[PDB]
Design a protein around this motif. Structure first.
Motif, short mmCIF file in Angstrom:
data_model
loop_
_atom_site.label_atom_id
_atom_site.label_comp_id
_atom_site.label_asym_id
_atom_site.label_seq_id
_atom_site.Cartn_x
_atom_site.Cartn_y
_atom_site.Cartn_z
N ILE A 1 0.66 -1.41 0.16
CA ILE A 1 0.00 0.41 -0.14
C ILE A 1 1.44 1.00 0.37
O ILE A 1 1.60 1.01 0.90
CB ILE A 1 -0.96 -0.16 1.19
N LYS A 2 0.45 2.18 -1.31
CA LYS A 2 1.44 3.04 -0.90
C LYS A 2 -0.23 4.43 -1.61
O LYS A 2 -0.45 5.35 -2.52
CB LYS A 2 2.37 3.06 -2.09
N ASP A 3 -0.02 5.15 0.42
CA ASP A 3 -1.35 6.32 0.04
C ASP A 3 -2.42 6.32 -0.27
O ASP A 3 -2.65 5.45 -1.46
CB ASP A 3 -0.52 7.61 -0.41
N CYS A 4 -3.00 6.25 0.42
CA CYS A 4 -4.61 6.09 0.21
C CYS A 4 -5.72 6.64 1.45
O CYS A 4 -5.45 7.00 2.67
CB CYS A 4 -5.99 4.97 0.00
N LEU A 5 -7.25 6.12 1.37
CA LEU A 5 -7.75 6.28 2.19
C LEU A 5 -8.39 5.45 2.99
O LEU A 5 -9.54 5.72 4.63
CB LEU A 5 -8.50 7.81 2.15
N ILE A 6 -8.81 4.51 2.07
CA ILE A 6 -9.54 3.27 2.50
C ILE A 6 -11.25 3.95 2.51
O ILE A 6 -11.42 4.24 3.21
CB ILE A 6 -9.00 2.28 3.19
#
Lengths: 398, 344, 438, 324
Positions: free
Chosen positions: A374-379
């Motif tokens: 995972i490389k950056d998100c909000l989910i």
């Protein structure tokens, strides 16, 4: 008997799309604590004993009397089916107002003492005293202060300005030199007196105080029988404020600014991670009896921790769970060989072994899978996670 | 770092704010008086006239909001409640004799109140008494003093004034309006430079005027014909307490054979005795003495040097042998006859 | 060290705001406080260390030449060398700049001054700042304007000279410069604010002195553009064109000195009043910096100055701020205040003079009242004459008895356009014409 | 010739346009050097030509700046020396006889005068131990180098306290306060207005001066006169420290040139332009003091009463050269 605090929190903004609605706006998770607890505690730090807060029925249900702080909140159920503004809401609570008011918004977080601004309000009998922080396009605003940098003299926004700004040839003959500022951020700390709400009672044109009240006030505070009357209506302007104020050039405006410190309002998603990253530093002195990890959390990997690694209660951890200045909520299950850097997590998040998360955010009921790079998100909420993918610019839709 | 001579007198700064240590919703002290005390450190100082008026207004406002205790009466409750209030006000800045007389009068009025009347009746009576006091003791006295002093001004005179005082400006403006022609000389002194108020007022009125500083006072005395002064208090033995520098003017005027006149009201009569222009004074902030030289500002970081003290007095005392006439609302009398007449 | 400092002087007004009078005498030779208007500028230049000066004059240059040849600055002992250049083709400042560029006179930073400037300002600090700025960078700053701090209500601020200026706060650099004549609103372009961050300072409390420190490069910019004719055009063109051009213009503001320029009657009165009251200390009437044997004074109380051999009658009263020349005779029971009297004048008895200026050779009859008037060389007034404020009489004119001119009257020896003399206009046995209006 | 004229013009121009950071001793030395130079060159026939030339130059330099008095004193002293030398060489006063040893004698006499001038401040400072005692309070105003040396010499043995008045509006008392603080002496600075309030606790007053007149009067800084009066109110002695070249054979007849006036900028700023058109401001600099208020004179000879001063004059300047 001298100041009544009014806390406003109804509605979010364009930047918020999945937080202010699914989660109560006052109770959004920053530092494993609701955000509205931050300003309210400040109100209890000075010694205020009366707090009036307006909100919707859902927030009232989410609130009830669940906190154990000494203040006795007085919640008024605003009609939820409305496009209400500041002026209309303060119009609603007018019968409950008798003395000077202090308007505050829950989205604001600051560490500056309010004794200075209240001193400025007290000494110079000013009509109002707002707060601006040094800037850290949207039609940039320009504010012009005098030589001493305490009295507001001019204010304008680029929205209605086309290519130039015009200054009347009477201000300079009284204040020879003025100084302009462009990069500034406003703060909702309007310390106005009782006369303003009485004046706006009979005028319904004003709907939002920030974009409608202060411009007219600062425009009218300067001119007199000349200019605003000689060059330019009690029965037409609904008993103008000048006719209102009859007590022992009566309207004066003052503004204070500071250069060092933290003062910001979380209305953009960009400032969210700066907030939740810098709030532990404030919490270290604010509450010196709060461990970085909750006591009732099932900790296993107690040696792979970075900085503070905030962790909520009942949070099971796996061994070799490397963490670097991350946020973790309650009832979170973590397996082995999971690496997390500068990421946010909150209640009810399950994680599988062999994961790797970098600079991301995780929402409720999210199940991390093995080998997830995972490389950056909000989910999103209530969704499982697969391997790899995720981006800062290309944030996962779900 | 006070002078050993002035060790007893306390020294205060203008940047040690006392408001940081109590709650913003003030409950210990009434908010209006907190605002008054805050304003005391910025301005609202003029010959104990504006200060007394503001204090009386704040006291009236405080008396307005009062609740009678169930097991107590007003007479003791209000008296016991008021002490921390003006104690804190004194902590803000030292008081003056006029305020002492005013608070003594208010306490005397409070004690004499009987318990037969209602709370509202007592409140209205106290407000009426305060209004009567302020109306009788200040405005009419000033009018009478101006009327009396109108007779001592003649055409072609040259009158000398010092400092800022409302009474002198009122007298001069009334005399000029009445149809008399003369000219005025203003003398100023560092660091307050309060004579500019008088200069501006006189210029706006339409009176010819000249302006200069204190050390050149002996240069222009051959032209002057009268000296007119105000006062801050009147001691029992007949001395006059005023701003520092008045005694110098009196001495040089006596050396040049010029009469001296002093104007004052009858509610500033004190019961203290002093024999020298020393001992009982008040110190001020020494940093105001720093000269704005523009380049190479001397005395900068004056605390760095081992032995270096800065002195800043506020008051001085003039003996009765240098004053020839005193004008009060009761008439004109010689200085040495002040205590026998006014004591009653 | 750089070469010695050099100065350029412009001795032609190129204006028509002083033209009921300038028919006879050029502007630079007008008498202020009994001293010519060109001595002040030369003394100011000398006191600051200037070692060479150029002079340009076209209109009636013969009188200027003969006056300069008799001054003390042409003596061999003078430390400042004076050179005279005259021509009849000059029409504006641009022509002078083109000529000096063509002749290649200046070699380094120099000064440029008009012909009527009164000041006592030292320059060394501004020169050092300019040299440092032009040394750290290369040909960025090509000008350094000079201003004096003042309030917007002083009587030395005529409506025709007020300006408004926008500067950068950190380094003094002029970003905008506008003249305000008959405008009730001021506008500024929006490009200034977005370029900078924390200062777009706007100032309206500055007084212009028309003193500049110019590099040779300026001359070139006055040759490429053949339409430039004044300093304002140059400043506006440089500020507007911002592709490369001259890069920047800087400013320097003084606070404890003096400086002014005379361009009309109002400025003349203000400057004379300021000079009498010792506002320019080193240059005072009793100092006698011209070392002329015919001009001396004795300071007394209430700012009273008297020259040699002055007779006074019985009952006369002098109030304050009075200058008397040499050989002046005064009658009995007069009243003179705030006045200046030139050398060799005769005055009768029972005369009242207030805020009036009389030059040499003027005779006034007894029983008259004058207020706020200017009398030129060799004028005369008969008995029973009362002049209302704002009156002007040029040379050789006479006014007959039993008359009372209204406010604003102007009388000149030349005809109204240049006939008999109307007994109603110039009185009985009066010689002159009524010009009417300004 | 050219060098002499250039030097004369430079000196006169420096005198007229105020001056510079020059003390009295430097001014006296420059005047004496210039007089020696003019004596050396500019060949003359007899004493009469020399006297006329010197008198003309002295009149010019005196009219250059009236308030400066040392130049005239030096000119008169040189004239008296010339008179004495001519009287010695010669056996109806006539100055036409020719000699050859005159110039050498004049030059060596001027050299002796310079040598005497150099060693002056030390002699005055050497007497500091006979007036200042332990546990004493001394009052002073302004900034004078002679008083500074006088106090510093006696500071090496005893301890005392010094009070300095700021002397507005130039406020030069801060410099002396700092200089005396650096030497390790208790000091206190206060404004002018509090002179009379604190006079009751002062033991002595020591001051300097700008000029000394024939009858013992003083020309000092602005605030001196009142300072002299208050002391007389308490019979506190007053002491003046000054060398011998500040003595002039003048009398206080006309005060039109006595005081010196400067621009009113120092008192009222220019930013008050609304009301500056109707207010007149006066800024005197110097001040007159009568001789009845002075107790003792201290110089490089010793202590003297104000009455003795007259005698000194009669043995310093010839009566003829009182008016140049």
């Amino acid at each position: 008997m001298e100041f009544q605090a009014v806390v406003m929190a109804v509605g979010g903004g364009s930047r918020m799309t999945d937080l202010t609605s699914s989660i109560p706006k006052p109770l959004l998770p920053v530092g494993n604590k609701p955000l509205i607890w931050y300003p309210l505690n400040l109100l209890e730090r000075v010694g205020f004993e009366e707090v009036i807060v307006v909100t919707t029925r859902d927030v009232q249900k989410a609130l009830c009397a669940e906190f154990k702080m000494k203040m006795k909140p007085d919640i008024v159920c605003i009609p939820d089916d409305a496009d209400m503004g500041t002026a209309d809401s303060l119009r609603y609570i007018y019968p409950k107002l008798k003395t000077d008011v202090l308007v505050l918004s829950c989205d604001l977080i600051t560490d500056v003492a309010l004794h200075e601004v209240v001193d400025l309000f007290r000494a110079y009998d000013a009509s109002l005293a707002m707060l601006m922080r040094k800037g850290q396009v949207e039609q940039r605003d320009f504010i012009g202060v005098d030589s001493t940098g305490k009295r507001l003299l001019f204010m304008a926004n680029e929205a209605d300005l086309d290519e130039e700004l015009v200054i009347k040839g009477s201000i300079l003959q009284k204040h020879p030199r003025i100084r302009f500022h462009t990069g500034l951020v406003d703060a909702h700390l309007y310390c106005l007196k009782k006369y303003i709400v009485d004046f706006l009672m009979e005028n319904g044109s004003i709907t939002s105080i920030r974009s409608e009240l202060i411009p007219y006030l600062v425009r009218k505070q300067f001119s007199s029988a000349s200019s605003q009357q000689g060059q330019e209506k009690k029965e037409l302007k609904s008993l103008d404020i000048y006719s209102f104020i009859k007590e022992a050039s009566q309207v004066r405006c003052y503004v204070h600014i500071m250069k060092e410190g933290l003062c910001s309002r979380v209305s953009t998603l960009g400032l969210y991670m700066e907030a939740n990253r810098q709030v532990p530093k404030l919490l270290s002195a604010l509450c010196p009896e709060e461990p970085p990890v909750h006591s009732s959390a099932q900790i296993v990997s107690k040696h792979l921790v970075g900085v503070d690694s905030l962790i909520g209660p009942e949070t099971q951890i796996g061994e070799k769970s490397s963490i670097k200045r991350s946020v973790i909520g309650s009832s979170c299950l973590i397996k082995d060989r999971v690496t997390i850097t500068n990421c946010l997590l909150m209640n009810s998040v399950t994680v599988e072994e062999g994961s790797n998360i970098q600079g991301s955010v995780i929402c409720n009921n999210a199940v991390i899978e093995k080998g997830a790079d995972i490389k950056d998100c909000l989910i999103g909420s209530g969704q499982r996670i697969e391997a790899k993918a995720k981006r800062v610019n290309e944030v996962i839709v779900g | 770092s006070k002078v050993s001579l002035f060790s007893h007198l306390p020294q205060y700064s203008r940047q040690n704010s006392l408001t940081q240590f109590m709650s913003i919703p003030s409950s210990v002290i009434h908010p209006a008086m907190v605002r008054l005390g805050l304003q005391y450190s910025q301005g609202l100082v003029s010959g104990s006239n504006a200060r007394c008026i503001a204090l009386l207004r704040a006291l009236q406002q405080v008396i307005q909001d009062y609740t009678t205790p169930p097991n107590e009466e007003l007479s003791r409750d209000l008296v016991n409640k008021l002490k921390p209030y003006m104690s804190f006000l004194t902590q803000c800045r030292p008081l003056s004799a006029s305020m002492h007389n005013a608070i003594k009068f208010l306490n005397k009025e409070i004690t004499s109140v009987g318990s037969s009347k209602r709370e509202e009746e007592a409140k209205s009576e106290l407000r009426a008494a305060i209004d009567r006091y302020v109306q009788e003791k200040i405005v009419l006295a000033a009018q009478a003093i101006s009327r009396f002093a109108y007779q001592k001004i003649s055409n072609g005179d040259v009158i000398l004034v010092y400092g800022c005082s409302s009474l002198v400006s009122r007298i001069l403006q009334e005399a000029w309006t009445e149809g008399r022609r003369f000219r005025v000389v203003v003398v100023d002194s560092r660091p307050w430079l309060e004579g500019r108020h008088t200069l501006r007022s006189l210029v706006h009125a339409g009176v010819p005027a000249s302006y200069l500083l204190i050390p050149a006072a002996s240069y222009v005395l051959p032209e002057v014909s009268k000296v007119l002064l105000g006062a801050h208090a009147l001691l029992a033995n007949g001395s006059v307490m005023s701003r520092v520098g008045t005694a110098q003017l009196a001495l040089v005027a006596r050396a040049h054979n010029v009469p001296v006149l002093v104007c004052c009201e009858t509610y500033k009569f004190c019961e203290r005795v002093q024999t020298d222009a020393f001992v009982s004074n008040e110190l001020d902030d020494p940093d105001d003495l720093q000269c704005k030289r523009g380049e190479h500002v001397a005395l900068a970081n004056w605390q760095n040097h081992a032995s270096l003290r800065l002195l800043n007095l506020v008051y001085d005392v003039t003996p009765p042998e240098l004053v020839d006439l005193v004008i009060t609302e009761l008439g004109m009398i010689p200085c040495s006859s002040v205590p026998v007449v006014l004591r009653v | 060290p750089p070469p010695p400092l050099q100065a350029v002087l412009v001795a032609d007004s190129f204006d028509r705001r002083f033209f009921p009078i300038s028919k006879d005498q050029p502007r630079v030779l007008l008498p202020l406080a009994n001293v010519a208007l060109i001595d002040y500028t030369l003394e100011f230049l000398t006191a600051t260390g200037v070692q060479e000066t150029f002079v340009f004059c076209c209109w009636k240059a013969a009188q200027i030449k003969e006056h300069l040849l008799k001054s003390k600055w042409c003596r061999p002992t003078s430390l400042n060398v004076v050179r005279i250049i005259t021509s009849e083709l000059y029409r504006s400042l641009g022509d002078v700049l083109r000529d000096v560029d063509a002749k290649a006179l200046v070699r380094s930073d120099f000064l440029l001054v008009y012909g009527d400037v009164i000041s006592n300002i030292n320059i060394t600090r501004a020169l050092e700042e300019h040299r440092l700025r032009r040394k750290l960078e290369k040909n960025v700053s090509v000008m350094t304007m000079i201003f004096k701090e003042s309030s917007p209500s002083h009587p030395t601020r005529c409506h025709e000279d007020n300006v408004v200026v926008a500067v950068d706060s950190t380094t003094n650099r002029v970003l905008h410069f506008q003249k305000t004549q008959g405008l009730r609103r001021f506008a500024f372009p929006l490009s200034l604010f977005q370029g900078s961050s924390d200062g777009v300072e706007v100032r309206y409390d500055l007084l212009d002195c028309h003193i500049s420190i110019c590099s040779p490069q300026v001359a070139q910019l006055f040759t490429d553009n053949f339409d430039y004719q004044t300093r304002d055009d140059f400043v506006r063109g440089l500020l507007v064109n911002e592709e490369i051009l001259g890069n920047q213009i800087h400013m320097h503001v003084t606070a404890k000195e003096y400086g002014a320029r005379v361009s009309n009657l109002h400025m003349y009165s203000a400057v004379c009043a300021d000079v009498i009251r010792r506002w320019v200390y080193p240059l005072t009437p009793e100092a006698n910096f011209t070392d002329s044997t015919t001009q001396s004074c004795t300071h007394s109380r209430h700012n009273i100055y008297r020259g040699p051999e002055v007779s006074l009658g019985h009952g006369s009263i002098l109030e304050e701020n009075v200058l008397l020349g040499s050989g002046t005779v005064i009658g009995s029971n007069c009243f003179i205040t705030n006045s200046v009297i030139g050398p060799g004048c005769h005055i009768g008895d029972n005369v009242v003079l207030d805020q009036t200026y009389l030059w040499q050779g003027v005779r006034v009859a007894a029983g008259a009242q004058i207020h706020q008037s200017l009398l030129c060389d060799n004028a005369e007034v008969k008995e029973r004459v009362t002049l209302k404020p704002r009156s002007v009489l040029t040379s050789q004119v006479v006014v007959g008895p039993n008359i009372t001119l209204p406010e604003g009257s102007v009388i000149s020896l030349h005809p109204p356009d240049a006939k008999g003399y109307n007994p109603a206009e110039v009185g009985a046995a009066g010689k002159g014409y009524l010009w009417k209006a300004a | 010739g050219s060098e002499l004229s250039e030097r004369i013009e430079s000196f006169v121009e420096t005198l007229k346009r105020g001056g510079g950071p020059r003390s009295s001793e430097e001014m006296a030395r420059e005047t004496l050097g210039l007089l020696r130079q003019i004596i050396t060159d500019h060949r003359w026939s007899n004493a009469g030509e020399l006297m006329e030339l010197i008198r003309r130059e002295g009149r010019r330099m005196t009219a250059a700046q009236p308030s400066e008095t040392t130049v005239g004193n030096m000119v008169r002293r040189v004239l008296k020396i010339i008179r004495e030398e001519y009287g010695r060489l010669h056996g109806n006063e006539d100055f036409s006889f020719h000699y050859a040893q005159l110039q050498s004698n004049i030059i060596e006499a001027i050299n002796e005068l310079l040598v005497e001038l150099e060693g002056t401040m030390e002699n005055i400072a050497a007497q500091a131990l006979e007036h200042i005692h332990s546990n004493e309070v001394i009052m002073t105003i302004g900034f004078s180098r002679t008083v500074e040396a006088f106090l510093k010499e006696a500071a090496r043995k005893r301890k005392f306290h010094v009070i300095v008045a700021e002397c507005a509006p130039f406020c030069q008392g801060h410099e002396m306060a700092v200089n005396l603080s650096k030497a390790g002496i208790e000091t206190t600075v206060m404004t002018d207005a509090a002179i009379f309030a604190v006079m009751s606790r002062v033991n002595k007053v020591i001051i300097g001066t700008k000029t000394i007149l024939a009858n013992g009067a003083l020309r000092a800084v602005t605030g001196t006169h009142t300072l002299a009066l208050a002391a007389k109110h308490h019979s506190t002695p007053l002491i003046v420290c000054a060398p011998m070249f500040k003595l002039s054979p003048q009398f206080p007849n006309e005060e039109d040139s006595f005081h010196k006036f400067v621009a009113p900028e120092e008192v009222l700023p220019f930013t008050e332009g609304d009301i500056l058109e109707k207010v007149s401001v006066h800024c005197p600099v110097f001040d007159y003091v009568p001789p009845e208020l002075i107790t003792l004179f201290i110089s490089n000879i010793g202590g003297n009463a104000p009455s003795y001063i007259y005698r000194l004059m009669s043995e310093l300047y010839h009566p003829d050269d009182h008016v140049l």
